[PDB]
């Protein structure tokens, strides 16, 4: 079962469904994504919407941001996730940018700040280069410089009126780092049958482990790798057989399934071999969100943003997420156990970064080639 945090389940379930749309349109390429991040910035966007645009977002997310206690619970979740100290291992930021001289509904801006403790950001898009710089500089200054540019800002021009962005960086310190000395080159088998020699880490430990089956009965392994805070973990999932494609797993993912993986795990002594990886993804959220039914928000004269402004037309010109994640021997900072059963992750695999106290799915991705 999920831990008791209802808003974490809501955010994660919606974010995982968005990820599935991204992965389906990216069949055999690397993707990293943040379910929590997309849910957080669309929860904020809910407050700007009205009419059928609002109904589409609320239906797809499964809640209304204005409902009693919902925004405070999201603010409490944010604090629980981001409050604890970390070794510059994680950074996130959300931003909604709106044309500076649009007449805003009276009371909107204070109401947004009351619910979210952050502001919608007014920008003059007629000064195209300055607007592009402001958006990129916001992301650079709120990710500690780890993400400094969105390529999607190349679409910002003098006609832009409403932009949303979410950017996250993650590079966590394992509870038990992999020994530097055990890293080594090993063949990785790609989905097309070709191979590539890549650096892989290795360590022997007692790992939380479970074996599940897909609805077609293919076995797959799931391992938990805890981070040092004892609160975050990375789950690694891959089919046992090389001939089973990773889509067999991504097509059935859900927040509920991930909680079931964790509930069924026991700790087994194993030699784990895992590729290092450093992935960055920037995704235009329009098509994934349209596929979940949020079509009006992207269409001029159909989008309804009347809680934010009565000016027409007004629609989302740009909705971007950019995530950068590093998996290495010990995260952001600098002994081998010397024969047990081995689990060798030498084919495409899924990863999930999960906050265990709440169930929050912070990151998710598919490594098709490290
Ligand atoms: O704050 C704003 N506009 C505003 C207008 C009317 C009322 C209120 C308000 C807030 C609470 O109560 C009333 C805010 C704003 O444009 N900010 C920003 C713009 C650009 C950038 Cl790059 C950053 C920010 C920021 O804020 O970091």
Author numbering: 2 to 335, 339 to 342, 348 to 379
Give verbatim excerpts from the published study on this entry.
Plasminogen activator inhibitor-1 (PAI-1), a member of the serine protease inhibitor (serpin) superfamily, acts by inhibiting tissue-type (tPA) and urokinase-type (uPA) plasminogen activators (PAs). To this end, PAI-1 exposes a flexible reactive center loop (RCL) at its surface, which contains the substrate-mimicking peptide sequence Arg346-Met347 (designated as P1–P1′). In contrast to other serpins, PAI-1 has the unique ability to spontaneously convert into a stable latent form by inserting the RCL segment N-terminal to the P1–P1′ cleavage site (residues 331 to 346, designated as P16-P1) in the core β-sheet A without prior cleavage to become strand 4 (s4A).
After crystallization screening of two stabilized active PAI-1 mutants, PAI-1-W175F and PAI-1-N150H-K154T-Q301P-Q319L-M354I (PAI-1-stab), free or in complex with PAI-1 neutralizing nanobodies (Nb42 and Nb64), diffracting crystals were obtained and soaked with the compounds. In the case of the PAI-1-stab crystal, two PAI-1 molecules (chains A and B) were observed of which only one had TM5484 compound bound (chain A). Indeed, in the case of the second PAI-1 molecule (chain B), access to the binding site is restricted due to close crystallographic contacts with a PAI-1 molecule from the neighboring ASU. Comparison of TM5484 in the compound-bound structures shows TM5484 at the crystallographic interface between PAI-1 and Nb64 (in the PAI-1/Nb42/Nb64 crystal), or between two PAI-1 molecules (in the PAI-1-stab crystal). In this respect, it is notable that the carboxylic acid interacts with PAI-1 Lys122 (s1A) through the formation of a salt bridge independent of the orientation of TM5484, and with PAI-1 Thr120 (s1A) through an additional hydrogen bond in orientation 2. In orientation 2, the Cl-atom is located 4.3 Å away from the sidechain of Trp139 in hF and 5.4 Å away from the ring centroid in an edge-on geometry, thus resulting in weaker interactions. Additionally, the Cl-atom makes a 3.4 Å van der Waals interaction with the side chain of Ile135 in hF. In orientation 2, however, the neighboring PAI-1-stab molecule forms a π–π stacking interaction and an electrostatic π-anion interaction with the chloroanthranilic acid moiety of TM5484 through Trp86. Furthermore, Lys88 and Val334 engage in hydrophobic interactions (π-alkyl and amide-π stacking, and π-sigma, respectively) with the phenylfuran moiety of TM5484.
